[PDB]
Design a binder for this molecule. Structure first.
Ligand SMILES: Cc1cc2nc3c(=O)[nH]c(=O)nc-3n(C[C@H](O)[C@H](O)[C@H](O)COP(=O)(O)OP(=O)(O)OC[C@H]3O[C@@H](n4cnc5c(N)ncnc54)[C@H](O)[C@@H]3O)c2cc1C
Ligand SMILES: Cc1cc2nc3c(=O)[nH]c(=O)nc-3n(C[C@H](O)[C@H](O)[C@H](O)COP(=O)(O)OP(=O)(O)OC[C@H]3O[C@@H](n4cnc5c(N)ncnc54)[C@H](O)[C@@H]3O)c2cc1C
Ligand SMILES: Cc1cc2nc3c(=O)[nH]c(=O)nc-3n(C[C@H](O)[C@H](O)[C@H](O)COP(=O)(O)OP(=O)(O)OC[C@H]3O[C@@H](n4cnc5c(N)ncnc54)[C@H](O)[C@@H]3O)c2cc1C
Ligand SMILES: Cc1cc2nc3c(=O)[nH]c(=O)nc-3n(C[C@H](O)[C@H](O)[C@H](O)COP(=O)(O)OP(=O)(O)OC[C@H]3O[C@@H](n4cnc5c(N)ncnc54)[C@H](O)[C@@H]3O)c2cc1C
Ligand SMILES: NC(=O)c1ccc[n+]([C@@H]2O[C@H](COP(=O)([O-])OP(=O)(O)OC[C@H]3O[C@@H](n4cnc5c(N)ncnc54)[C@H](OP(=O)(O)O)[C@@H]3O)[C@@H](O)[C@H]2O)c1
Ligand SMILES: NC(=O)c1ccc[n+]([C@@H]2O[C@H](COP(=O)([O-])OP(=O)(O)OC[C@H]3O[C@@H](n4cnc5c(N)ncnc54)[C@H](OP(=O)(O)O)[C@@H]3O)[C@@H](O)[C@H]2O)c1
Lengths: 323, 323, 323, 323
């Protein structure tokens, strides 16, 4: 098979950051990535603009420099590739990790392509592969999406967005610009505080001009092939509808985490894996986590700017157990 | 059922132009589009730049104005949508025509959503949905694509491009920029003349700096999941290969075209459908074609710049038959 | 000399707008523009982003279409030229009007290039060309600018911005992004309400992170070659300083407006010329005004969006007067 | 009155490269830049696109990374500012060096702000600040420019471009897209080979579609207030003309080079300073040159790509001379 000192699952920004810092401390690493590096950013909507300036998205002392104040999706793609190039990272792409088992102070990794054995393990699988379940009648119709890519094809289509965070407001602005008839249905009373303060004004101006319908305290009750039905303050309303974007968030793959022996916890920030806040070691010895996997659900506690510092934390602890 | 004077199958640029021009002659028309309007352009590679200046893509008295010299893919999308808004065109999107039958002096159109009855029929389906077949061992593996979209995921992958015209050279530049190891295998003796003269220098410079492998007189003989084997002057070579981009062109849906009763016609121009060069009417009375479909095989006869003129021709002939 | 029915001083969007609508009524016009068309937009800062969507900046039967939400400076430049091209407008560029006198029912216009005589006259000279006078010691130093263009050359220079409106806040973000040490000195107590609600948060963040110095209740008292001295509620502070941006607003050339015989007003809200409100005719018979020059009495501002509608009103009144 | 070990005159890319390389070897450096860093690039036409990929513009191990194939002008500005920050280079901006004289183990440098005294001097003044003399009647009219910035204000004006290299060809394209009536007058027989091969096809298409006038073997004889008169193989022609773009090249400031005591000496290829090819030291001990100024006699061209390597070679010779 293959024997590597350390393996990292996930080549997102926090996984990449983990490999660099371990390499800086002389630990030979291998990143195993289900897609290619930073698939998450690759799957952003085409025109997405980050909300961090780009120095705050940079990892391992390769500067992320762009003329705009905030960088776009494709600039991050070009940046993180250069990071891999510059740090000479060993990346196994298009190889999904399917099973991890610990065996006599060693890990046994089974992927869709090979079998590996390693001493240190780092799970940076993030949360984007598992979208929250909608739970209304019709939530499985193919007209329902949990991801937004481009708005052009929904030109002159009656579209509904369920949810109220940055994904919801981003998609509605883009869909309105492309000629969809957009209805946002949000179950809260007022705009979520996590919508970034320099975006909400562009969205709110359009709802005031009767160009987008914004409904608060709205819960969707039924989705058919050509209608959506929602209730507001008890009152049920039914509107014609061609497509539904369920922008209701994501969550980590807990099945995968449990099957390696990692515990769920429920504490200050919700259901999170068990880990040593000071070193990021989990209950399974020599198994670390990095990235938004450490936060759990609340997609506003850990992003790239804080998550990229895990790797350095992991490196100190991994180097320490080298007596 | 549904009764319309005129139906146009295809909401690409040529379909749209045909609708405008018929409407200008007092003909009530309906576009039935399997996707949404200008799906073709919607399915271009993401960062694609047109080779036409943008005055030459403009249709139906809506000026296409951009600050760049040649427009990018997303600008055309914004533009063609506005064309539909301005000209109040009826487009039934996400509705594939499945069957056309002639009965008395009326056509009966069966789609995935309804049945229509019309006097005049205009097939503007273009050729991008039907790719030329590779015809080598391994062409059905999932590592073989006939459409290029974005290059990032092929970062650090060993990629082979089959073909020689603008699709191959566009995709090679984009894949090289994204850090792939690109090998172009072209069955010709020299660069195809139809590659645009302001792109080619960017390709050859990278070729001359040994950044892309370019092979002439090369025919691919086998594709396995991790190799490609091709012949050059009889000599066989086998190189490791992760993905294959078969940029060998596209062709009209001749099955659908025959199933309505239209004759295929062996010309010394490239075997195309039967049509009156002066009116674009087929062998079936009141059934016209417009767009690149009238070119047949070669794709250097009809593009948007001239193909957008069929509409004006067809409208005259339909008006001659009156109503 | 030269004899034209109607003359328009000013080829900004509102001057151009007046010409199109008068021409639509079969009235011959000539635009005399001190620069070339839309010089004002041309003298915007290089990277300036309009605050309107681009349909609200469109004039005269030419759609303003862009893929972004709000268009950039050069997109409007490209656009307003096509408006002139499409409407075949006579424009005499690089010709400043210096002198207007009434004799009979006829005007005699004296420019730096010719002498003109016309029946209808429209003064659409806007306000961007005459900056408010600073009125501090040192305001004549060459280090004092009343216009912002690009920020690069102020890299690692100590810069002061006088003012607190959109010009001041835009210029500060640009200068900070380019590495200047920026101090904004504003004579008010809080952020001006006219700062766009989607821009302010980016500025506010930089102030809170000590990347820009923001001083309220700040009045500048002296500018020397290498210091700036200001008072904050009376206490004097003096800082090292390399350049000064007095973004303290603009005003129409009222000198020119009186020198033809038009009364100003100065009343409560502001200070504007006399005009009929229903025709936009001034106290001088057959003398109209258009554009932001008409702002001042009314408790509203005039941007391109509402100001461009003057032209239509003007055309009717000129159409009533026949001739 | 101020004392530094080494001084570099010129803060363009090759000067900056010199400072980094000297700093890597422990030499105290100071850049004196008449403008701010990379003023030459700052004075490019607003929309200039480099012809180098951006890897080749990188200096001192700060990677220049951009999503597009060739970088634009403002990206080069953003990058070179980040190099100065990243290495912490001392740059005294807006301080023109007027005089250098040799005295003892020291140079005495006179600028418009101070006097310096140093051991090592590196003159990296480039050529973009000194335009070749036009030397025809009218070359001093204000309608004659030796620098191109933006094309919009020349909308619908009669423009003449003198020259035949990329500056002329770039300017013609930018001036044609903005609606000028462009006549390029070149004293040569055919297109200059130095025009980049992916740009020439865009100009040629415009010449062939009679939208730009291109005249070969044309020499300009007179510039009047509103005409230009040129001879083509002796035949005289006179055309109406509003502005003149003398894109006839540039040259290093050779007086300044002589006034320090460095010998210039012309050949084939041109005139260059006298210097050792292995150390880049001039005839004056401890006075080096860097950048395109070293071009002239070598029959080789010096761009940012090759010119940026002087600094390292110069650092060796300076370090060899020890302390
Ligand atoms: C539209 C949008 C905009 C955003 N903007 C910002 C922003 O401006 N700033 C910011 O800080 N954050 C932003 N984020 C959040 C950002 O995406 C995350 O914070 C970041 O990706 C978390 O890092 P990670 O490496 O943990 O996640 P990921 O990038 O998701 O890393 C997980 C990676 O591991 C791979 N993987 C998963 N399971 C397996 C498996 N079993 N085997 C192998 N590989 C596997 C995945 O394919 C993926 O590439 C944004 C998110 C979205 C959706
Ligand atoms: C990468 C790339 C770059 C190009 N650049 C240029 C360029 O710069 N200039 C230029 O002139 N051309 C360019 N082209 C070619 C351009 O796409 C064609 O000229 C043009 O798209 C043909 O227009 P059309 O409407 O005739 O066919 P299409 O554009 O393909 O439109 C046909 C439409 O019919 C729909 N359809 C098909 N079958 C059915 C059915 N049964 N029922 C309903 N709808 C159906 C399809 O979904 C499609 O939307 C480019 C092509 C590619 C691939
Ligand atoms: C940085 C900035 C951003 C802005 N953004 C927006 C925005 O997003 N949306 C918006 O609606 N507005 C915006 N504005 C305001 C906009 O510039 C004005 O509303 C607009 O210019 C009004 O046009 P106008 O035709 O009245 O006059 P102007 O545009 O000022 O044009 C007057 C013209 O007449 C010429 N002229 C003046 N005097 C004479 C004379 N004596 N003889 C001959 N010619 C003369 C001038 O040179 C000029 O070309 C912005 C302004 C600035 C400074
Ligand atoms: C339109 C255009 C496009 C170009 N595109 C490219 C391209 O794609 N790739 C490429 O490699 N090159 C390109 N060039 C050329 C490129 O600008 C030069 O290679 C580059 O400027 C060389 O830099 P340098 O280090 O010699 O110093 P320069 O860039 O020439 O400048 C030296 C500096 O010295 C300063 N200085 C001058 N006199 C004094 C003084 N007395 N005291 C103090 N400071 C002084 C100047 O202000 C200037 O900042 C282009 C040039 C132009 C005009
Ligand atoms: N720089 C950065 O850190 C950065 C940048 C960009 C984006 N982001 C993150 O990306 C997020 C985008 O939103 P998201 O896609 O992740 O959504 P999310 O955070 O999961 O929340 C989606 C919204 O939908 C509602 N919702 C959830 N489940 C629902 C159900 N079953 N039925 C009906 N409504 C439901 C929620 O209401 P409640 O409000 O009641 O929970 C919530 O407001 C932002 O919120 C931000 O956290 C971060
Ligand atoms: N510049 C651009 O942005 C751009 C990009 C892509 C496409 N386009 C336009 O879009 C259209 C289609 O693009 P395209 O370039 O993919 O199609 P194409 O122009 O037909 O290109 C096909 C290429 O593959 C080779 N080939 C054809 N059939 C083959 C087979 N059966 N087996 C192996 N090799 C084969 C051809 O060789 P021969 O040369 O010997 O025929 C040719 O080089 C054209 O109008 C094109 O101009 C423009």
């Amino acid at each position: 098979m293959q024997k590597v000192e350390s393996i990292i699952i996930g080549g997102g920004p926090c996984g990449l950051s983990a490999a660099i810092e371990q390499k800086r401390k002389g630990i030979d690493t291998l990143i195993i990535e289900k897609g290619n590096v930073v698939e998450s950013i690759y799957n952003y909507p085409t025109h997405q603009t980050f909300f961090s300036s780009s120095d705050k998205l940079s990892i391992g002392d390769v500067p992320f420099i762009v003329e705009e104040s905030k960088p776009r999706r494709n600039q991050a793609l070009v940046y993180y590739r250069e990071v891999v190039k510059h740090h000479q990272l060993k990346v196994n792409a298009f190889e999904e990790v399917l099973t991890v088992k610990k065996m006599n102070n060693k890990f046994t990794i089974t992927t869709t392509k090979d079998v590996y054995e390693c001493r240190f393990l780092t799970i940076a699988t993030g949360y984007y592969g598992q979208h929250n379940t909608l739970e209304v009648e019709g939530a499985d119709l193919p007209k329902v999406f949990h991801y937004f890519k481009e708005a052009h094809p929904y030109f002159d289509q009656d579209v509904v967005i369920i949810g109220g965070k940055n994904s919801a407001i981003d998609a509605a602005l883009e869909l309105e610009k492309a000629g969809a008839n957009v209805t946002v249905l949000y179950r809260g009373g007022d705009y979520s505080p996590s919508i970034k303060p320099w975006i909400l004004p562009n969205f709110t101006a359009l709802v005031n001009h009767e160009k987008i319908d914004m409904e608060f305290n709205a819960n969707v009750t039924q989705i058919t092939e050509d209608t959506v039905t929602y209730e507001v303050n008890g009152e049920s309303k039914t509107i014609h509808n061609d497509y539904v974007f369920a922008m209701i968030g994501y969550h980590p793959d807990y099945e995968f985490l449990k099957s390696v022996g990692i515990q769920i916890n429920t504490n200050e920030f919700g259901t999170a894996p068990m880990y040593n806040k000071e070193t990021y070691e989990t209950n399974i010895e020599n198994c670390y986590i990095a990235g938004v996997i450490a936060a759990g659900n609340d997609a506003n506690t850990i992003f790239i700017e804080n998550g990229k510092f895990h790797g350095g934390i992991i490196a100190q602890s991994m180097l320490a157990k080298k007596q």
